[PDB]
Design a binder for this molecule. Sequence first.
Ligand SMILES: CC1(C)CC(=O)N(CC(=O)N2CCC(N3N=C(c4ccc(OC(F)F)c(OC(F)F)c4)[C@H]4CC=CC[C@H]4C3=O)CC2)C(=O)C1
Ligand SMILES: [Mg+2]
Ligand SMILES: [Zn+2]
Length: 333
Amino acid sequence: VTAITKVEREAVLVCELPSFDVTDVEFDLFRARESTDKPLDVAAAIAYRLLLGSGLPQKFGCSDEVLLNFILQCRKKYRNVPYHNFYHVVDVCQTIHTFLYRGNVYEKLTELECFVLLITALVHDLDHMGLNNSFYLKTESPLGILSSASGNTSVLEVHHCNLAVEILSDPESDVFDGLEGAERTLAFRSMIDCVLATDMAKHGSALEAFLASAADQSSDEAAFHRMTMEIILKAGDISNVTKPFDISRQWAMAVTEEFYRQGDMEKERGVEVLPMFDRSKNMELAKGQIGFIDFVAAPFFQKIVDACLQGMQWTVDRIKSNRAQWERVLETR
Ligand SMILES: CC1(C)CC(=O)N(CC(=O)N2CCC(N3N=C(c4ccc(OC(F)F)c(OC(F)F)c4)[C@H]4CC=CC[C@H]4C3=O)CC2)C(=O)C1
Ligand SMILES: [Mg+2]
Ligand SMILES: [Zn+2]
């Protein structure tokens, strides 16, 4: 990895974020990005401020400069795609911060685990190209062939972990360099476990395991911690429907356009195009959001909150308010 420069750091360090509270559940990243002509720097500054404000990097021997270096090394490996770009990972990082600290999920985890989760947010989609795992498998792309030959169908997630390990292999961007022995092993394993658990093909199994652990007062403690981390990163990843409506809608627009660009490529290659990826199906945003809410997000958030994460009740509340608002879009159309 090429070293991050003084000038790259300074460009983040000059951003002051006047009028934003990066800790708040109603924080608006889109408004942040509209606030200046250097939205990549502002986004990096948001992530930097979240991580320093937690007080965690300092505790684990991670200097301000190495933190910032890490952030910028992550930033350089996001692509200019509509949804899976740097702003998504910063959003996930900020969202996780709220679940840990406004939702009191920090109480279930060690400080190191909280630190790992915040850092893992920033790595969890590295070098996404706006195409899902299915695209690579269907088209027998080289990465798809490799995944199948090597026995792991989570095509992208293994790729993201690869790039995360590369970033962390240089002390100048290794936020875990202050760790050794068991703690360092836990930091890397937990980060990788969490990234691997973001594959939506494993959603139901991940959720069911967590719920069975939370219900068992004799669950293995280390396993419960790890599953809680996995579920929190998953929660962040499907959290767009938990945000104020207008934020939620802007995310939905970005994901829809990404999906449509995939579908356009699949059409060119003569492979199967799912309806949600087909521009010509012209699917209404409201109906798709209601469907994602009903079949994925509402039961996920309700189940985890009820099982164990009572402080995150607001997520269920906001999903219910967003669903009602989409229903009003349909009612008035
Ligand atoms: C069609 C149905 C009636 C039945 C059904 O099975 N599903 C689920 C479904 O079709 N899935 C599962 C999730 C997948 N998925 N979808 C993402 C995503 C993000 C934000 C979204 O909008 C808003 F929140 F911004 C969004 O909503 C829109 F798609 F509806 C989807 C990502 C989540 C995690 C990782 C990468 C992205 C990923 O793997 C896509 C396939 C239904 O949607 C209803
Ligand atoms: Mg992902
Ligand atoms: Zn993601």
